[PDB]
Amino acid sequence: VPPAIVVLIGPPGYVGKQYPITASDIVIGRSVESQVYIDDKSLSRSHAKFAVNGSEVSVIDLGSTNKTIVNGQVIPPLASCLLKNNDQIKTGNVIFKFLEKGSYDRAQKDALTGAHSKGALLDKGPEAMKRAEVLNEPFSLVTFDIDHFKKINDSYGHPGGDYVLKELCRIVITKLIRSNDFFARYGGEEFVLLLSGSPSKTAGEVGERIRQTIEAHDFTFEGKKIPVTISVGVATKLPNETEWTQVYDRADKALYQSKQGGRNRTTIV
Amino acid sequence: VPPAIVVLIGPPGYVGKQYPITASDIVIGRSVESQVYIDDKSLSRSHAKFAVNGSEVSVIDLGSTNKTIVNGQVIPPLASCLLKNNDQIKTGNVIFKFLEKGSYDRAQKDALTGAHSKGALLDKGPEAMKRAEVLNEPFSLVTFDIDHFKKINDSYGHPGGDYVLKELCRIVITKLIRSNDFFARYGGEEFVLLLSGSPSKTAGEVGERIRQTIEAHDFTFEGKKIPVTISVGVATKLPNETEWTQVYDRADKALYQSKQGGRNRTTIVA
Ligand SMILES: Nc1nc2c(ncn2[C@@H]2O[C@@H]3COP(=O)(O)O[C@H]4[C@@H](O)[C@H](n5cnc6c(=O)[nH]c(N)nc65)O[C@@H]4COP(=O)(O)O[C@H]3[C@H]2O)c(=O)[nH]1
Ligand SMILES: Nc1nc2c(ncn2[C@@H]2O[C@@H]3COP(=O)(O)O[C@H]4[C@@H](O)[C@H](n5cnc6c(=O)[nH]c(N)nc65)O[C@@H]4COP(=O)(O)O[C@H]3[C@H]2O)c(=O)[nH]1
Ligand SMILES: [Cl-]
Ligand SMILES: [Cl-]
Ligand SMILES: [Cl-]
Ligand SMILES: [Cl-]
Ligand SMILES: [Cl-]
């Protein structure tokens, strides 16, 4: 069973895709002739190639603009770097893992990535921080809180508030955000949306779209209409931040500025 | 002062032209995106490229039909040759000299509208087909044109029609499609939108979003309202299709059905 590379980060549709490295002169590139064809402008048309010498697989940079980087080390043009199991190869904004031994429908593809927020927030946070750092790509976090949630629980019981939390999560994930966006509950009454690739301005606009849609949605629990609004806070990862909760903390401070300004609104910074 | 290649023989206008080899990823080819773009049919679209490792400059053949030949020796596909002063590099019928010391816009965007050009679309189409095939993912195409465009030009002048094309494309590009969705002018007042990974249902929704937004938008040309609508045709790549123009042809048939069905509508090819 031949060695392979698996896409860790790449354009939509590519993550989890495996390419067997069966021979020398297999090329990673954005040219259609590439055996490892990745439709991404950060790759050169012919970016890097493989050399196979029995069991030894090496990668060679082909004079790429955005470099070939193995485990964080730049490989100079035409130099050959011997690969071993679990090495990471970064070519532009695409990152592969090398497997000494390599391993389909609509549900199987969505399982592959954990689309529509299957994952855990405590896993996804660190993933987003690592991605932002390795790609030098903006990462924004939007936090939301239900206004007057204690009043909802007092008036309709804890099961009423539970219904609202569960229903709000359902609507956001299934109707309002992209399948590769990550949305989760965090603590008692808060929600976190991770937007890898989104700068502050964009994150604010997404947060506001969600705020207005939730405001307009009819929450009916056991035949009774519950008024629901949310307050919103937005932050974008800074260079000095190393834990995702640091981004959350600033987003949460923005949220409570939104709440102390009259609630049912969005604040950025 | 960087190394360069100088054209010794080539098409008229090229001889004596020097191309600095200032970094890696400089490609010789007949594709417009090539840094060393030579308009000669004997060159491959991407023929050869350079690799720079400090003061060492090498050339790499990219599987070219007519070969990359350095001082009479053929360089096999994907192999490199370290260059030295006065080496001659022959790529098809064009010959360069390498000099250890030597002495335009590639965006492919329409001047009026800022959409991608027809030439860009002609390159992007094969890429979209390859992506659909390797990912086993739907590919959809939406095509449209402005209804009664001749009447707009007659009534408001050619600058009025120009305003409409430019404004319509501003709305589409900046408000209605994703930044990685590919939108191009395809002759005249026809436009093509490529939707990677999008089934028919999605493509129809995008087509309708565009049609409805344009219908409702105020095209105000020197204080006066121009009524603007578009007719839309939509198709989705079928399993047996191998060229993007096959998908285009079916979308264009749907567009003509839109025109014959009253205009200002979307038709999804049945
Ligand atoms: N206002 C706004 N809402 C957004 C945006 N991005 C995502 N959403 C919302 O989030 C829903 C799901 O997004 P999706 O998973 O990417 O799933 C989408 C996506 O795969 C596709 N799609 C829709 N519009 C476009 C488009 O313009 N370009 C491309 N490439 N795909 C689109 O169709 C799916 C369903 O689309 P919708 O029914 O509209 O359902 C959208 C839409 O309600 C945005 O940029 N602006
Ligand atoms: N990760 C993430 N980002 C979001 C989302 N919603 C909005 N955005 C981001 O916010 C930008 C502007 O959103 P827009 O005003 O709705 O303006 C959008 C919208 O009018 C339209 N559109 C694009 N995708 C969709 C979609 O899935 N559904 C609908 N109904 N419209 C879409 O095309 C415009 C430009 O789209 P983009 O270039 O992608 O630019 C988007 C995109 O970067 C979201 O749910 N998830
Ligand atoms: Cl390139
Ligand atoms: Cl290249
Ligand atoms: Cl973390
Ligand atoms: Cl060619
Ligand atoms: Cl017409």
Numbering used by the authors:
A (entry chain A): 32 to 134, 144 to 309
B (entry chain B): 32 to 134, 144 to 310
Could you share sentences copied from the article?
B. bacteriovorus is an obligate bacterial predator of other Gram-negative bacteria, exploiting adaptations that allow consumption from inside the prey cell periplasm. The DgcB protein appends the C-terminal GGDEF enzymatic domain with an N-terminal forkhead-associated (FHA) domain, known to be used (in other proteins) for interactions with phosphopeptide ligands. DgcB comprised a ~30aa tail, 100aa FHA, 20aa linker and 160aa GGDEF domain.
Distance constraints guided the assignment of FHA domains to their respective GGDEF partners, revealing a unique conformation for each chain. The bound c-di-GMP dimer at the DgcB I-site is orientated in line with the two-fold axis of the GGDEF dimer, complexed by R218 and D221 of the conserved RxxD motif. Examination of the pocket reveals that the putative phosphate site is occupied by a bound ion in chain B, and that of chain A is partially occluded by residue D56. The vast majority of contacts to the GGDEF dimer are made by the chain A FHA domain; these comprises both polar (D70 and K48 to chain B) and non-polar (I40 and I126 to chain A, Y45 and Y68 to chain B) interactions. Hence, most GGDEF proteins do not adopt this orientation as it would lead to steric clashes of the appended sensory domains, but in DgcB this conformation is enabled by having the chain B FHA domain offset.
